[PDB]
């Protein structure tokens, strides 16, 4: 009775196909158009063509690289900086910290300078 096993494999293959194309599906929200004169519908599209539309600036956005990195299930280096072992200081903050470390009177300012 390989009839039933064959037809069940048919069904399972097609079910896996439908789930695979349903789990690869990206939604873009509703918003103003370009040359703003109305609203556009929310758009549903496959992951790759949506990443294409983001890359070619057909769906305008500011954080373009950040969006494309998130849609590809990966983290950029901004994501790895904001969630890193130890925070690293800017130049101005390095200078302020040198001015804060050590009561050596390195400041050299008083209120009457003004």
């Amino acid at each position: 009775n390989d009839n039933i096993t064959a037809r069940l494999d048919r069904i399972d293959e097609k079910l896996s196909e439908i789930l695979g194309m349903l789990h690869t599906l990206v939604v873009a929200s509703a918003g103003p158009t370009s040359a703003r004169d109305g609203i556009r519908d929310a758009m549903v599209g496959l992951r790759e063509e949506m990443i294409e539309k983001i890359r070619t600036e057909a769906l305008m956005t500011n954080d373009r690289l950040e969006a494309m990195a998130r849609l590809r299930n990966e983290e950029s280096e901004k994501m790895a900086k904001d969630t890193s072992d130890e925070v690293s200081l800017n130049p101005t903050s390095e200078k302020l910290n040198n001015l804060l470390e050590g009561n050596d009177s390195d400041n050299d300012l008083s209120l009457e300078d003004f």
């Binding site: 349903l22 789990h23 599906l25 990206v26 939604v27 873009a28 929200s29 509703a30 918003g31 103003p32 703003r36 609203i39 929310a42 549903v44 949506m50 983001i54 769906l59 305008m60 956005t61 500011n62 954080d63 950040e66 969006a67 998130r70 849609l71 994501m79 904001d82 969630t83 072992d85 130890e86 925070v87 690293s88 200081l89 800017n90 101005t92 903050s93 200078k95 302020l96 910290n97 001015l99 804060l100 009561n103 400041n107 050299d108 300012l109 209120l111 300078d113 003004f114």
Partner: protein
């Protein structure tokens, strides 16, 4: 007939555009910014700006300016000039020093009386106390840093008092003043200020709110210096007397000066940098409480934040003042880059002020209030919000379905927990097999047994209606004391007529003929009073028919007061209803909204800009479930369906848009700065509960994906996650490293999952920790709590938190604010002396400069003091003021805080506490001993007082309505009147002429309904005022009373329907005579012969204060018997022993800590909180969610009423008429829904709104854990004397008294006692047995009340609603 009273404190905002427009007109060029405000302000000036520029002094000053002799500046330049002002002659120095010396001496002399009374009661012992004699020797030379701020405050306050008085007398007054504050010249007005410094050759223009802010700054710094001077002297006398912090006041003044320099260097932009030194305090705290990795990470992030703020401030400053009149005003230390040095100094001083002490470091949060407020630019705030709210987001469908499935899981779990049943599904054939079994068995799986496929499967469910919408509108949720937005066609009436084009002025006057008089209202109350076509079922029909959709009247108006948003009246109704339904039905399911090692961390997130990233696709997948549970469409989804189609406009008065001619429609005006379209949802404040419960659902999803546990807590706009996880330690790994790795991994998860739904967090809001949490500004560390209590008393001053400058409300505000230095600061005496400083200032110094009475209240107070001097046989009018300021306000005196409030916080009878306070105070002069019993000792001052109290002429009127409103009222004109009583008749006569027929018909029957409510329960022979309160609260007159009491709290009740901000002189006269009568109450209450010389004076042998109170309260009303109100005072009833008796015979309190001092320490016991008993009733079994909330409230009221009054011989007709009239059922159909009470003493257990339900101590809750109490011997004695019979003394208040007694004895002796024993006076305790009521209720009058006020009745219980109750 119309006067204008102006503000004394800052209540609004400082306007960028008012200042910019005024200065652009005056100096003839772009003042602060090159925008449209300056251009329209110079083209078509207002009339007040023309008046200001037209004066002779202004003409001369700007003539001097246009020749290049004076230089323009920024208001922060002059803030730094004022706060530095020292100039004063030897005479002025002597005068200020003398005034301060007198104030301080008089405050210590007032406080001596209470301190003597307390030391006399505890048995511890022109100034009799040795403690305050030493304190007076300490405080006889104020320091210079204190005289500085006192002189500055006095000057600025004199200037403002001058202006306000002369503007009440005359309208349009401008105050020109160059002699008050030497060097400076002021031109004040309510429309602008002009300040001129002649020796420095500087001039500035600002607004009236900015002058108010300067005065408030100087008062704040004076209060800081005063508090710290007082507490440092106290702490030098005894280390336990002062506060737990200790400051050096030559460092705090340097902090003041350096912050002022930072604000003078960076202009208005400097408030960026000032706003970043909160994180510096936090970092200094975490350097104490945290371990290496957490605190290093926090420190580095903080430094980055600070320097980013300063770089942004410099960039924005240089770009703003570039093509304006202020381009030459930018310092050279800004492009040099040397500002950083100055910044350094600031931070170092903070680190010196903190002193590596958690006490100083947690107190130092007052630094963020003490530099003023910025001018808010409205158009640029709008322009910042626009970019985030116009963006496109990208989601994966799996993300949305898992979020929706987690929401549905929360709902299912909550239904099974609360209602013992799944919600009703309408597509149950989507569940595979396992969830069908969970549905049939009425169970759910756990989070550990749950999966992500399970959430995606739950995401497919649809529901049948479970809850119901109210069909009649509730008036108390929609009526308000705020402003309202005009329709979209009448929006151009938001701006002055001069600032609008000539084609908009012709169009407004023709459009105003097409709208009703309710649509042109500009206030919410006026919006509702002017509606002659109102209907109770209008909001219901709107929500059901979706009339808020595609509506051509919708607009969004943003004002400066962080961008408060408004819309017209219909949409405001719909918003309020959606939030109310979520709060009522749904928040019960979301309760956090109100292996060899267990790793633990904690994440803190700021969700203040959370709403800008929400789109329809993320909010409404969940608001759709909420729609289906209520049977509606679009109600909970209203925002993201309506707001994308309207215009957002900045409707501040001085910030109009540029309308190009031919254009009169708002949706056709060009987008510009301060006006835009296509807002993709997220208006702040609206729809906040929805977003909170969505955040909680997302946290559940994160905990399922990360496989740890979460304990969330969302309190406003700050969430605090506690994450726990069982792990197995590696080789050579410590616990701290394990917790740090947990924190980092959880942080990556949280970032991923928030970014998946469109919320991109950033390293500024979020921070990780492991043990501590700044819980909504509350530092706790190791179970000990560190308060910021100086921040609460900064604005304590004369006329605070009052309407029309009412004297009594100012005294009450001062008292209740100053109690924070005792309830949190844990110092009785510092709070006392600070209170007395400001009370003496308000009474003896500022009562003769009233803006409306002008000296009349001071002449009244002098009459009162002479009466007191004669009655009590005092020495002079300086002893009489010391006496008046220590007498209760109930009797007509001036003490806002009674003694019992220092030991426990709640009492069930105010009259006994008032009489005991008076006895304890008069002991100071009569020399009675508060440890003995009462005798008569050669001195009949206390006999005279008590005789005058119990002897008076009877004059009762409206006894039962008055005891319904205030169950503790006194009657016969034996107490002071409040504002609700004076303005009631005025409010009803104003409401009788409203176009809205609901308010008119209610207000025309008000007096007759009052007469019926009096003649409704007047034949029940023992009077129980707490049962009269239930009878009152279960009738439709309660709602009308609430609305009238709302309206009577406004300024000028008379001018509500007149479109004016002025005050009618009848309102002034009413308030003035209220004030004068309230002042001379004490003359009326203490006659100079005790109401007759031949009346036998009160003999005080075998006297009971509780019987005396009962007699006074009954004689004042002429009622034979009043039950359930009189209860003994714990402070008077209990005697305090410190040695172990033979037999203890009382309550025993004991110290479990080993240390001699327990302040700032934690103990082994459990915290004491009061927590009155839990009710013993039986709830019936029916479907509760078929009734609304108000129907269940009415059912519980009638159940209580059927419990208390089950003894009268009318009960059947009474309860039948109540049930029919209020609920629509008969008594037999309604009695099946009543909770049945198993108790027998309703005199002990009844829960009304007029009774306390908690009895906490006057001590922080962490501090109660050091002590242990034992109440066995007093139970033995009380049971041998009475025996299985209820008595009238409260248990929680005895425990609270004992605990606070431990605290206070430690404060005063510097040693905490090992044990305290409390022994009661048994002649103060009586029987509290429930009575047998006789006589019957008046059913005709009950019907009359129900029928006259019928329009405030709730929904009736239907038949399609009553059949479904038992299905």
């Amino acid at each position: 007939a119309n006067v204008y009273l102006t503000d004394s404190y800052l209540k609004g905002v400082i306007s960028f555009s008012e200042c910019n427009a005024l200065g652009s007109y005056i100096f003839n060029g772009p003042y602060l910014k090159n925008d449209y405000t300056n251009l329209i302000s110079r083209q078509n000036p207002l009339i007040e700006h023309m008046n200001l520029k037209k004066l002779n002094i202004t003409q001369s000053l700007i003539s001097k300016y246009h020749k290049g002799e004076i230089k323009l500046e920024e208001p922060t330049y002059f803030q730094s000039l004022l706060m530095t002002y020292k100039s004063m002659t030897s005479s002025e120095q002597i005068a200020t020093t003398n005034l301060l010396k007198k104030i301080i001496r008089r405050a210590i002399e007032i406080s001596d009386v209470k301190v003597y009374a307390i030391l006399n009661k505890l048995g511890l012992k022109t100034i009799k106390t040795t403690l305050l004699k030493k304190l007076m020797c300490s405080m006889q030379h104020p320091p210079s840093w204190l005289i500085h701020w006192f002189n500055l405050y006095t000057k600025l306050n004199n200037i403002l008092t001058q202006y306000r008085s002369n503007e009440v007398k005359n309208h349009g007054f401008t105050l020109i003043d160059n002699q008050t504050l030497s060097g400076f010249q002021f031109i004040l007005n309510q429309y602008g200020c002009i300040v001129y410094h002649k020796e420095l050759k500087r001039i500035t223009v600002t607004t009236y709110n900015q002058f108010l802010t300067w005065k408030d700054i100087s008062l704040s710094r004076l209060n800081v210096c005063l508090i710290t001077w007082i507490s440092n002297c106290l702490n030098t006398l005894n280390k336990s007397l002062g506060l737990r912090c200790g400051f050096n006041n030559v460092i705090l003044t340097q902090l003041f000066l350096y912050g002022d320099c930072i604000l003078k260097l960076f202009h208005n932009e400097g408030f960026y940098i000032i706003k970043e030194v909160e994180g510096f305090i936090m970092s200094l705290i975490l350097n104490i409480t945290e371990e290496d990795q957490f605190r290093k990470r926090f420190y580095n992030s903080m430094l980055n934040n600070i320097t980013d703020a300063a770089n942004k401030a410099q960039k924005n400053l240089l770009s703003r003042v570039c093509h304006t009149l202020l381009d030459k005003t930018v310092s050279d230390n800004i492009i040099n880059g040397r500002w950083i040095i100055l910044l350094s100094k600031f931070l170092k001083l903070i680190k010196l002020a903190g002193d590596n002490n958690l006490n100083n470091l947690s107190e130092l949060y007052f630094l963020f209030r003490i530099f003023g407020h910025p001018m808010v630019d409205e158009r640029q705030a709008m322009d910042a919000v626009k970019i985030n709210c116009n963006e496109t987001k990208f989601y994966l469908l799996s993300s949305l379905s898992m979020l929706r499935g987690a929401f549905i899981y929360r709902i299912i779990k909550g239904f099974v927990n609360n209602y013992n049943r799944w919600p009703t599904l309408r597509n149950a054939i989507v569940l595979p097999l396992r969830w069908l079994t969970y549905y049939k068995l009425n169970t759910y799986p756990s989070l550990l047994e749950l999966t992500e496929r399970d959430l995606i499967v739950l995401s497919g469910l649809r529901f049948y209606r479970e809850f119901r919408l109210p069909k009649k509108v509730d008036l108390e949720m929609i009526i308000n004391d705020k402003a309202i937005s005009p329709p979209k066609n009448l929006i151009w009436t938001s701006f002055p007529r001069n600032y609008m084009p000539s084609h908009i002025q012709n169009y407004i006057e023709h459009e105003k003929l097409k709208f009703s008089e309710s649509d042109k209202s500009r206030r919410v109350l006026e919006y509702y009073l002017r509606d002659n076509k109102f209907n109770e079922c209008d909001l219901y029909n709107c929500v059901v028919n979706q009339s808020y959709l595609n509506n051509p009247n919708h607009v969004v108006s943003l004002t400066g007061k962080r961008m408060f948003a408004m819309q017209p009246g219909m949409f405001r109704q719909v918003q309020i209803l959606a939030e109310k339904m979520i709060a009522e039905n749904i928040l019960q399911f979301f309760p956090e909204s109100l292996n060899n090692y267990i790793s633990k961390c904690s994440i803190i997130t700021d969700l203040s800009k959370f709403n800008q990233a929400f789109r329809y696709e993320t909010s409404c997948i969940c608001s759709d479930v909420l729609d289906e549970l209520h049977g509606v469409q679009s109600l909970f989804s209203w925002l993201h369906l309506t707001i994308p189609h309207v215009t957002i406009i900045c409707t501040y008065r001085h910030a109009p848009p540029y309308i190009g001619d031919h254009i009169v429609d708002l949706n056709n005006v060009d987008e510009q700065s301060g006006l835009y379209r296509y807002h993709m949802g997220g208006i702040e404040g609206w729809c906040q509960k929805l977003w909170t419960i969505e955040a909680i659902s997302l946290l559940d999803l994160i905990s399922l994906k990360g496989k740890f546990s979460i304990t969330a807590l969302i309190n406003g706009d700050n969430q605090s996650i506690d994450i726990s996880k069982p792990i197995r330690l590696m080789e050579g790994q410590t616990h701290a490293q394990a917790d740090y790795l947990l924190a980092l991994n959880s942080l990556k998860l949280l970032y991923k999952e928030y970014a998946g739904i469109g919320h991109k967090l950033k390293g500024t809001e979020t921070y990780i920790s492991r043990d501590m949490q700044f819980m909504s500004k509350t530092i706790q560390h190791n179970g000990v709590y560190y308060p910021a209590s100086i921040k609460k008393v900064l604005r304590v001053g004369p006329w605070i938190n009052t309407i029309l400058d009412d004297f009594k409300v100012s005294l009450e505000s001062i008292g209740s604010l100053t109690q924070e230095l005792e309830y949190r600061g844990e110092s009785l005496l510092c709070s006392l002396i600070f209170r007395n400083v400001w009370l003496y200032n308000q009474i003896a110094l500022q009562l003769k400069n009233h803006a409306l009475c002008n000296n009349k209240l001071y002449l009244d107070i002098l009459k009162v003091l002479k009466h007191l001097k004669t009655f009590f046989n005092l020495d002079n009018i300086d002893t009489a003021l010391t006496l008046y300021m220590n007498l209760p306000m109930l009797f007509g005196g001036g003490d806002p805080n009674l003694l019992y409030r220092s030991f426990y916080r709640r009492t069930p009878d105010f009259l006994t506490e008032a009489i005991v306070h008076s006895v304890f105070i008069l002991s100071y002069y009569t020399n009675h001993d508060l440890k003995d019993k009462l005798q008569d000792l050669s001195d009949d001052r206390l006999n005279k007082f008590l005789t005058c109290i119990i002897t008076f002429d009877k004059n009762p009127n409206a006894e039962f309505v008055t005891l319904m409103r205030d169950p503790q009222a006194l009657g016969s004109e034996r107490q002071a009147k409040i504002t609700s009583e004076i303005n009631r008749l005025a409010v009803t006569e104003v409401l009788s002429t409203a176009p809205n027929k609901i308010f008119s018909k209610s207000a025309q029957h008000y007096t007759t309904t009052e007469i019926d409510l009096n003649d409704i329960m007047q034949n029940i022979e023992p009077t129980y005022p707490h049962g009269l309160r239930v009878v009152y609260e279960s009738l439709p007159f309660y709602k009308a009373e609430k609305i009238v009491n709302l309206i009577s709290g406004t300024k000028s009740i008379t001018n509500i329907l007149e479109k004016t901000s002025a005050i009618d002189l009848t309102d002034i006269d009413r308030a003035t005579e209220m004030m004068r009568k309230n002042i001379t109450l004490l003359i009326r209450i203490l006659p100079l012969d005790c109401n007759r010389d031949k009346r036998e004076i009160l003999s005080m042998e075998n006297l009971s204060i509780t019987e005396l109170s009962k007699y006074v309260r009954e004689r004042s009303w002429s009622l034979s018997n009043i039950v359930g109100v009189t209860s003994p005072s714990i402070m008077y009833t209990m005697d305090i022993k410190y040695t172990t008796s033979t037999i203890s015979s009382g309550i025993i309190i004991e110290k479990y800590n080993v240390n001699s001092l327990t302040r700032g320490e934690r103990g082994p016991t459990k915290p004491w909180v009061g927590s009155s008993t839990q009710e013993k009733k039986t709830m019936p079994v029916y479907n509760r969610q078929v009734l609304t909330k108000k129907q269940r409230d009415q059912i519980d009221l009638l159940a209580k009423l059927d419990w208390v009054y089950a003894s009268i011989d009318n009960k059947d007709e009474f309860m039948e008429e109540l049930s029919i009239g209020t609920l629509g059922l008969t008594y037999e159909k309604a009695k099946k829904l009543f909770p049945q009470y198993l108790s027998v003493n309703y005199l002990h257990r009844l829960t009304v709104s007029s009774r306390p339900c908690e009895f906490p101590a006057s001590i922080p809750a962490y501090r109660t854990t050091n002590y242990h109490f034992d109440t066995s011997p007093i139970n033995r004695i009380l049971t041998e004397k009475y025996g299985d019979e209820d008595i009238d003394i409260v248990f929680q208040n005895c425990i609270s008294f004992g605990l606070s007694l431990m605290s206070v004895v430690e404060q005063f002796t510097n040693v905490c006692p090992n044990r305290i024993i409390l022994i009661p006076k048994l002649n103060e305790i009586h029987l509290m047995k429930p009575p047998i009521f006789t006589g019957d209720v008046d059913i005709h009058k009950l019907k009359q009340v129900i029928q006259k006020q019928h329009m405030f009745l709730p929904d009736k219980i239907s038949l399609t609603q009553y059949v479904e109750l038992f299905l």
